[PDB]
Amino acid sequence: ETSEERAARLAKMSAYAAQRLAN
């Protein structure tokens, strides 16, 4: 567990579209 791991969490589960969850 480190700080670098956090950067990877978003790098792998990144999200550009913040308009999901609908329809």
- The DSSP annotation for 1-23 comes to --HHHHHHHHHHS--S----S--
Rounded-to-integer distance, Cα 15 and Cα 4, Å: 18
Neighbouring CB atoms inside 10 A of 20's CB total 7
- Extract long-range pairs of 12-15: CB within 8 Å, 24+ residues apart: none
Q: Structure solved using which method?
A: NMR
Token pair, residue 6, equals: 């956090």
